[model samples]
Target: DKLAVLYAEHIATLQQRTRTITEREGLEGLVIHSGQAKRQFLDWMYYPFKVNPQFKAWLPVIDNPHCWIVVDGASKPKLIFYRPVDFWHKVPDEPRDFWAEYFDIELLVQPDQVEKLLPYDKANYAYIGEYLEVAQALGFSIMNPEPVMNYLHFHRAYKTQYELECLRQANRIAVEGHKAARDTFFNGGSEFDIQHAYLMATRQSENEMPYGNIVALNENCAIYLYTHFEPTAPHTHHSFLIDAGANFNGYAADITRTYDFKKSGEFSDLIQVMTEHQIALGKALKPGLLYGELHLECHQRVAQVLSDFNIVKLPAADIVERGITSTFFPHGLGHHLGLQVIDMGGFMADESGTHQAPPEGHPFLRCTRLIEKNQVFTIEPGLYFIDSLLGDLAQTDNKQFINWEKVEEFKPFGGIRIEDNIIVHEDSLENMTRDLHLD
Candidate 1:
């Protein structure tokens, strides 16, 4: 019953937000298309269908194709739900959920039937989706207009109550999966086995995962984007890193955890310290805080951790200024998290889309906007011993901060990364992952 109220408020906010764009762009309505799955090249099999993020922002009717939403910013939004009759595939049932009442829904048996149901004046409505050909064929002149997108995406960073609830549920589901994966890792399971346990615990398939699960064991954790799921377990498990998430009502929860098999070693200490630092960084999330500044602070903390561990001989300031921190931590501090794992408007300064690039030398930083209340993002700080990055550092004169012996000692244990999903409130921050006792 409470969900119904939240849905109502969510729809109302969407209508009001859309009205601003319509008035600014001189448009009467917006048409958002739920994308269709594409068939594989030279094959009849279709890839897993992914709903358009813009379309999903309105409704949770994911996994449906040929569906379109028409928002006129006044009357009830229209949902042209396409459930074609076919023997080859199963079609989505009629919409009768909590959100259905807010929409003026019309059943569509044919994809082309939407042409008749769409706004009478095609020139007055803008299209937002991946199917550009479909929109153009329907006489839509404005396709995913930049101004409209900028406004919508910028506001998306601020989650509505309904969206927050969905994200919370997503985190809950992923926490269970992480627990199962952790147990599997400790039980001497292979990378594939661990991933399977996660899927089983979350009650989701590989295709349904928010992103490709990163199940790295031992040295595999050092590779930033490891995908190889070794079928056989390693002889000696030094470390394990699993970066995975679950989806709830089209919202995603991104969480990562690292484990050390030897619970009393230096690697274990490293993991503990990194986890504490990650939590500290998350605690600092609040309104008016620039994400870039927080990222710079993360580098400072990384430098301190390195120096404390005797991995580097230089002071923290010199370590960061000389770019030595980049050798250990290559990626950004975090990013916006929502319907899309790395949600939109991360680098946008405003609704008009003034770009805010990451710090001068930190190009991988995903979010650079000022943090605000109700914004949801990830605070993931990692310390990796990447050979390539270290090799580059070796050629520089700053490589004199020798600690090669310590580096080799920790190399077998790979690296450490602790990630948590966060929600910035008016005066406090919520740690979605840790709140569930997943840590």
Candidate 2:
């Protein structure tokens, strides 16, 4: 249903980038390691492991402890993998995948063999891993050099064909969960119940999920989720908001859907109209465009939506001119999506990460860099009736733009947001979260 997913192609991308990384670092050789899994307190258990971005980029493997050395002289990259011979658990780690063929795997019985296995000169080797001090102690002369890290992170904005395919599958998987969340909501399910159904449909446990499943009901939908959840509130529950995703390999698809119960409220048409604006904005996700400029553009459009919904009395430009739209949008249009939910390099004006691109009052705007081909972004636009944030509207000069009684009528639904993942390109748009199924 999407582009071809050839691991061989991904290997080629990985291989070519090695030279880019080395050239930027000004080193003949480098040492990159799959990060060590951290342990929990007072127990042998470890946290749900996420492979380092460096490791996942080269090997396409997650949650394994391995070290890779890329040097000037070697025809092939060297791998000092952690494959302990001890089998205390049911299974043991080994170099069995096809990806291992690309690397010269130096099998290890214990973890510390990284210092022992590679014969490359310590003076020429720069290390990229979690434990910077440990790598320094291991005789790596350079510890996480900024030039190479910045170069590598900058290029990550461009997704390879294989990465695009992985994201497509992730979307398919998330679509199932989104539909299940909708079904459960209409059946009078609570927020907790809808959250359970979303995960169950996606077949991903919380640890395996790309991000925390957001299942907000009624007025609660106005609040964005982070580090918290409240049990379903006892109300009429006329609306629902789900911002959730599914993962494939290390790629992710971030999708959001807003629901209006019974399909009869003014909110139903509001969702349809707002989705059209979002899609139109998505078509502009082309190569060479500045994302911050695009975000400001979306803010203007959001004002138009507010006007159309009768929440505001002024024209779209007037609302934006008076900064009334800021109270409603409250967030950037969206963010870069990939290995991490809010991926790196969004704020990096260049490899330096020192100079920041200026945005028009949208301080939360990420992806300050110019857009490029094959990059992925989550283009989400939201309108909220945030009591605290909007509480000052009446006290401000922008108060004249308010249609107070109409705003009161829509307050019960609390908020509405439509989010979807888009692949940026010069010729066309690739929408991963295109389906919106409702009854």
Candidate 3:
């Protein structure tokens, strides 16, 4: 009830702001739908009566004849009214056909005219008129302004306590799912089999997948964006790249882990290098750091790792300067996480009000703003032998940057990435999604 009263007061304030906007813009009437839940007997019954004692003063005024409430269900349609019971006394007792009885109110009349003579066919008209009566009685205007008010406060919806809890829970389940995937790997399973096990683990945990799980085995791992069309890979020396996440309670946790089936030699070397770089980049996640800058840092770390292994043709400093690391780690560092998988409410402009765009060639970056406390995002730094990227680097100018002979040795090794979901904190970062110990 307190929430309802607070909501009503908020709504009233919004109505005042709406009137100001309409008067300034030379607009007449604005129409809005409250849906059945917002205007039902439950709201009124609990509000002035039970929820908040302060709202009792406005109860009598809200019970006006002009107020109309429509509750539409599969069985029948019911109309609720506060006053002027005499007008509805003659109305039908049985369910009426919606097509025959309901007509568009906008076509026949204006707001002023409808305020005087209530239409039996239009439930929304009755509701709006009643709202106006209540607003006027309560020293507010007779205008429908809740929608515009909501638009202004929509940004606040992104950072709610409830949403953050759901995200944490989703990430926990994703960790469980990843462990299940690891189990399949140890059992020497195929790509499809492993993917199926991952999905089943998610479902068993009462979670749904937000997207298709990527399960690439061996050279298939070299496919940067592979979704595992062919389950079986012929090469035993191949490593598997798994990128999957579980969606629970409308929140998601994206994670990726690479596994070498053979478990030794060159494939192991590549996986170790990629994983270390991923961990190195993740260590930099904290409040006040820009994501774009972090992405570049990750690129540098990956290049340096390759250089340390004597696999990189160019020096680490040279590669970082040329931005050659982007050819391998092309996607952005991460994005906002909340109600929507890629939650809204990113950076806004300065005095100019211009929105920041993603970096060139790194169009997949989900966020560009400085990481803030309480923000959750994925840290997925990957290395792959994508044909297109390789082809681009094969040019005369770019060729000098790659050791083609050494690259050919690791071609069969495929790709490797280590991903985890981290929540930015005041001092440090919380790795919410991490793999469980397999032992």
TM-score of each: 0.97, 0.91, 0.63
| Candidate 3: residue 175 lDDT (0-100) | 76
Off by over 4 Å in 3: 1-158, 204-207, 233-237, 347-353, 357-366, 435-439
Candidate with maximal TM-score = 1
Model 2, runs deviating above 4 Å: 1-5, 66-74, 85-87, 226-235, 349-356, 435-439
* Residue-by-residue lDDT tens digits, candidate 2, 70-92: 54433577777666665574555
> If ranked by lDDT, best first, what sequence of candidates would result?
1, 2, 3
lDDT tens string, model 1, 115-191? 88887779888999998888888999999999999999999998999999999999999999999999999999999
The whole-model lDDT of each prediction reads 0.90, 0.77, 0.56
lDDT of 1: 0.90
lDDT of 3 by residue, 315-367 (tens): 78887777677666666666666544555545422212234566564666647
Task: Give residue 37's lDDT in candidate 2 (0 to 100).
Answer: 76
Order by TM-score, highest first: 1, 2, 3
Cα displacement (angstroms), candidate 2, residue 91, comes to 1.6
> Can you list the residue pairs that collide in candidate 2?
none
- 188, model 2: CA deviation in Å? 1.5
